[PDB]
Design a protein around this motif. Structure first.
Motif, short mmCIF file in Angstrom:
data_model
loop_
_atom_site.label_atom_id
_atom_site.label_comp_id
_atom_site.label_asym_id
_atom_site.label_seq_id
_atom_site.Cartn_x
_atom_site.Cartn_y
_atom_site.Cartn_z
N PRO A 70 0.83 -1.18 0.00
CA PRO A 70 0.00 0.00 0.00
C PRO A 70 0.88 1.25 0.00
O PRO A 70 2.02 1.20 0.45
CB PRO A 70 -0.81 -0.15 1.29
N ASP A 71 0.35 2.34 -0.54
CA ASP A 71 1.07 3.60 -0.54
C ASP A 71 0.95 4.23 0.84
O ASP A 71 -0.02 3.99 1.56
CB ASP A 71 0.50 4.53 -1.61
N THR A 72 1.95 5.02 1.23
CA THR A 72 1.89 5.74 2.49
C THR A 72 0.71 6.69 2.45
O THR A 72 0.66 7.56 1.57
CB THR A 72 3.16 6.56 2.72
N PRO A 73 -0.26 6.55 3.38
CA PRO A 73 -1.46 7.39 3.30
C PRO A 73 -1.11 8.87 3.19
O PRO A 73 -0.42 9.41 4.06
CB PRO A 73 -2.19 7.09 4.63
N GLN A 74 -1.54 9.49 2.10
CA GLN A 74 -1.22 10.88 1.79
C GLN A 74 -2.33 11.80 2.27
O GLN A 74 -3.52 11.46 2.16
CB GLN A 74 -0.96 11.06 0.29
N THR A 83 -5.74 1.28 9.82
CA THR A 83 -5.93 1.25 11.27
C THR A 83 -5.36 2.50 11.93
O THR A 83 -4.15 2.75 11.85
CB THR A 83 -5.25 0.02 11.91
N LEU A 84 -6.21 3.27 12.58
CA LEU A 84 -5.76 4.49 13.25
C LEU A 84 -5.45 4.23 14.71
O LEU A 84 -6.36 4.02 15.51
CB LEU A 84 -6.80 5.60 13.13
N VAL A 85 -4.16 4.26 15.03
CA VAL A 85 -3.71 4.04 16.40
C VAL A 85 -3.32 5.37 17.04
O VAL A 85 -2.68 6.21 16.39
CB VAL A 85 -2.54 3.03 16.45
N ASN A 98 -1.67 12.08 19.24
CA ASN A 98 -0.56 11.68 18.38
C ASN A 98 -0.98 10.53 17.48
O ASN A 98 -0.69 9.37 17.77
CB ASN A 98 0.65 11.28 19.22
N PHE A 99 -1.66 10.88 16.39
CA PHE A 99 -2.19 9.91 15.43
C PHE A 99 -1.12 9.30 14.53
O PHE A 99 -0.14 9.94 14.17
CB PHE A 99 -3.28 10.54 14.57
N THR A 100 -1.35 8.04 14.17
CA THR A 100 -0.51 7.30 13.25
C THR A 100 -1.43 6.36 12.51
O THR A 100 -1.95 5.39 13.08
CB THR A 100 0.59 6.52 14.01
N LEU A 101 -1.66 6.67 11.24
CA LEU A 101 -2.52 5.85 10.40
C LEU A 101 -1.69 4.71 9.82
O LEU A 101 -0.74 4.94 9.06
CB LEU A 101 -3.12 6.69 9.28
N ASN A 102 -2.03 3.48 10.20
CA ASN A 102 -1.31 2.30 9.73
C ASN A 102 -2.01 1.67 8.54
O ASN A 102 -3.24 1.66 8.47
CB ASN A 102 -1.15 1.27 10.84
N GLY A 156 3.00 -5.60 1.77
CA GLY A 156 3.73 -4.62 2.59
C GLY A 156 2.94 -3.81 3.63
O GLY A 156 1.73 -4.01 3.80
N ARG A 157 3.63 -2.91 4.33
CA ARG A 157 2.98 -2.00 5.28
C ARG A 157 3.53 -0.60 5.14
O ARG A 157 4.70 -0.43 4.80
CB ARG A 157 3.19 -2.47 6.71
N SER A 158 2.68 0.39 5.41
CA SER A 158 3.10 1.79 5.42
C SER A 158 2.45 2.55 6.57
O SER A 158 1.49 2.06 7.19
CB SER A 158 2.76 2.47 4.09
N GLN A 159 2.95 3.75 6.86
CA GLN A 159 2.43 4.55 7.96
C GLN A 159 2.68 6.05 7.79
O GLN A 159 3.72 6.49 7.30
CB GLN A 159 3.03 4.08 9.29
N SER A 160 1.70 6.84 8.22
CA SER A 160 1.81 8.29 8.20
C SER A 160 1.25 8.80 9.52
O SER A 160 0.08 8.57 9.83
CB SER A 160 1.04 8.87 7.02
N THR A 161 2.10 9.46 10.31
CA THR A 161 1.67 9.92 11.63
C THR A 161 1.46 11.43 11.63
O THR A 161 2.14 12.16 10.90
CB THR A 161 2.70 9.57 12.72
N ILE A 162 0.52 11.90 12.44
CA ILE A 162 0.24 13.33 12.55
C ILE A 162 -0.26 13.68 13.95
O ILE A 162 -1.30 13.19 14.39
CB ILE A 162 -0.75 13.81 11.46
#
Ligand SMILES: *[C@H]1O[C@H](CO[C@H]2O[C@@H](C)[C@@H](O)[C@@H](O)[C@@H]2O)[C@@H](O[C@@H]2O[C@H](CO)[C@@H](O[C@@H]3O[C@H](CO)[C@@H](O)[C@H](O)[C@@H]3O)[C@H](O)[C@H]2NC(C)=O)[C@H](O)[C@H]1NC(C)=O
Ligand SMILES: *[C@@H]1O[C@H](CO[C@@H]2O[C@@H](C)[C@@H](O)[C@@H](O)[C@@H]2O)[C@@H](O[C@@H]2O[C@H](CO)[C@@H](O)[C@H](O)[C@H]2NC(C)=O)[C@H](O)[C@H]1NC(C)=O
Ligand SMILES: *[C@@H]1O[C@H](CO)[C@@H](O[C@@H]2O[C@H](CO)[C@@H](O)[C@H](O)[C@H]2NC(C)=O)[C@H](O)[C@H]1NC(C)=O
Ligand SMILES: *[C@@H]1O[C@H](CO)[C@@H](O[C@@H]2O[C@H](CO)[C@@H](O)[C@H](O)[C@H]2NC(C)=O)[C@H](O)[C@H]1NC(C)=O
Length: 479
Positions: A278-282, A315-317, A352-356, A362-368
């Motif tokens: 998957p692409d890193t969530p943009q 998954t939003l952790v 402190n969000f991190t969308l997994n 594969g796996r990707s992640q974008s945190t905000i």
């Protein structure tokens, strides 16, 4: 034609040539002269004498009758390691990988010496597939157990696989020549044809542009096989069993590409899915209508080319809170972008969000990280009128849902005259209960074909709101 060997740096097992002058079935008498004075009484050729590290020997042999021109020396020797033995070879057919485990009998070998293991994998007794070399040391003469695995390039089901192993022991302080051990006795693993599937592997997934082979067990000749209108040469494995190598695999369709083997009467096959991770969530942003819950919306990038029971999952952790939320999706009835909901925790105000993102490749992640308050977005007001006390201007009353008893607003009110001018004014009101509010104006032109409109804001800095139902209730003009 004498010869000396050794398997432990401790003893030399020698064995000389045949008889010069005496026939067969003769006893012997050998002596070893260095510093000591010990002799022997042999019946065969071998002798097994204690090993002499630094120093020469003086070996006397007598035929025991009708003598003997037998005299030689001894310095180094020839080191042949104890042929290793496989402890246990097993397979994980799902991943089509091999597991080997053996135990160097370090215990019966004195000095810390280096050793070289060589593992060998054949697919049919003959063909050689992987060749491994690991280098180490005979751990302080202790039996040390070793592990080695390998994920075959071809499924373990449609071909037999043998595995042998041997070693080389280099002892820094030995002077004699050091030869290789014998090959460990053969240890093979073949699958017993016991299923419905004759084609391997089934419903796998691979990174587009990879290489992959496919098995096909059978008892009746295979005529041909093709990927997708392609017809791949047949690799002939062992009982009318066939293989096919494939290269630079191309992007599969929504449904995986198919592979069919075909026979006289029937036809078999499997499917394959080639996609991307998957692409890193943009564009990951989280706003809020009310200070109760948050909306983290995002957009996926490159299409994984994998969907359905293998569509990419999100998954939003949350960092500190620890709370998360794994959105399950329909089979793409969403469009392009999608969001998810996260209930505010009491007394947080920072997340402190991190969308997994997970994917069978594969796996990707974008945190905000955020200050929820600085990211507030109020929903449009509702059900309001224009009535007041008798005189002067009008006192408006608007309704806005949520929980804001904690902060203030900057709801700018625009007053439009008789189809001409529209000055601007703003009155600040605190947060009330889940109910309407009460504002105020000052000295307005009675009637004069006036009109109203409203839009809010927050103490915090962010998006304004949708304008409300434009009203023009002109209070009294002539009395
Ligand atoms: C929300 O953001 C935090 C950022 O705050 C942390 O930043 C890190 C770098 C560290 O200084 C920590 O003290 C701050 O609180 C994300 O922080 C992630 O923290 C983990 C710690 O386990 C990092 O992984 C670690 O990496 C080191 C070496 O790289 C390893 O030795 C550790 O075993 C561990 O794996 C990770 O890099 C940080 N995340 C990233 C990629 O910035 C936090 O992940 C995020 N919220 C959550 C929980 O997802
Ligand atoms: C894998 O194939 C691509 C090209 O694939 C094309 O499209 C497929 C759907 C199918 O129809 C194929 O037959 C087509 O050829 C190769 O891409 C080329 O790669 C070279 C370098 O290797 C590069 O110079 C070219 O510009 C590429 N051409 C384009 C635009 O596709 C690719 O090389 C193949 N894999 C490997 C590693 O060789
Ligand atoms: C270790 O010891 C024997 C001793 O005879 C070795 O024999 C010597 O070999 C070297 C190299 O071939 C020669 O230069 C010598 O002339 C040989 N004898 C002497 C004088 O000692 C033997 O080759 C060695 N290895 C083995 C098998 O133990
Ligand atoms: C979350 O954001 C809000 C807004 O930035 C912070 O609350 C403000 O804190 C500053 C101090 O730097 C005060 O001057 C403001 O008056 C506060 N805003 C109002 C009027 O409510 C809040 O502190 C942030 N969260 C934290 C603790 O980092």
């Amino acid at each position: 034609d004498l010869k000396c060997v050794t398997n432990n740096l401790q003893v030399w097992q020698c064995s000389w040539k045949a008889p010069s002058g005496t026939g067969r079935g003769t006893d012997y008498e050998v002596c070893i002269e260095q510093r000591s004075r010990s002799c022997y009484q042999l019946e065969k050729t071998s002798i097994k004498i204690p090993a002499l590290s630094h120093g020469d020997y003086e070996i006397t042999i007598n035929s025991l009758h009708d003598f003997s021109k037998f005299t030689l020396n001894e310095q180094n020797v020839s080191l042949i390691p104890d042929t290793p033995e496989i402890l246990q070879l097993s397979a994980d057919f799902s991943t089509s990988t091999l597991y080997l485990k053996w135990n160097d009998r370090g215990s019966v070998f004195p000095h810390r010496s280096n050793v070289i293991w060589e593992i060998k994998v054949l697919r049919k007794e003959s063909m050689e597939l992987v060749k491994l070399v690991t280098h180490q040391t005979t751990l302080n003469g202790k039996d040390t157990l070793h592990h080695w695995s390998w994920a075959s390039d071809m499924p373990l089901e449609c071909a037999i696989h043998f595995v042998e192993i041997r070693c080389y022991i280099d002892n820094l302080h030995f002077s004699g020549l050091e030869e290789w051990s014998d090959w460990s006795p053969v240890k093979q693993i073949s699958w017993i044809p016991d299923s419905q599937t004759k084609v391997f592997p089934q419903d796998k997934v691979i990174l587009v542009g990879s290489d992959i082979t496919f098995c096909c067990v059978s008892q009746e000749k295979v005529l041909s096989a093709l990927i997708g209108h392609t017809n791949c040469p047949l690799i002939h494995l062992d009982g009318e069993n066939v293989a096919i190598k494939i290269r630079n695999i191309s992007v599969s369709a929504s449904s995986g590409t198919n592979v069919v083997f075909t026979t006289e009467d029937n036809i078999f096959g499997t499917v394959i899915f080639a996609g991307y991770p998957p692409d890193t969530p943009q564009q990951l942003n989280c706003e809020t209508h009310d200070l109760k819950e948050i909306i983290c919306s995002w957009n996926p990038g490159r299409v994984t080319a994998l969907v359905g029971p293998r569509a990419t999952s999100y998954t939003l952790v949350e960092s500190f809170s620890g709370k998360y939320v794994r959105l399950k999706r329909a089979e793409a009835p969403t469009n392009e972008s999608y969001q998810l909901l996260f209930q505010m925790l009491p007394n947080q105000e920072i997340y402190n969000f991190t969308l997994n993102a997970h994917n069978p490749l594969g796996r990707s992640q974008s945190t905000i990280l955020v200050n929820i308050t600085e990211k507030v977005y109020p929903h449009t007001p509702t059900s309001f009128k224009v009535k007041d006390i008798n005189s002067t201007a009008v006192k408006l009353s608007w309704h806005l849902p949520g929980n804001f008893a904690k902060i203030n607003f900057l709801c700018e009110i625009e007053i439009k005259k008789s189809n001409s001018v529209q000055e601007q004014r703003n009155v600040t009101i605190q947060g009330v209960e889940n109910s309407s509010y009460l504002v105020a104006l000052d000295k307005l032109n009675p009637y004069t074909l006036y009109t109203f409109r409203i839009r809010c804001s927050t103490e915090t800095f962010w998006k304004w709101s949708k304008w409300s139902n434009k009203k023009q209730h002109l209070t009294t003009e002539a009395s």
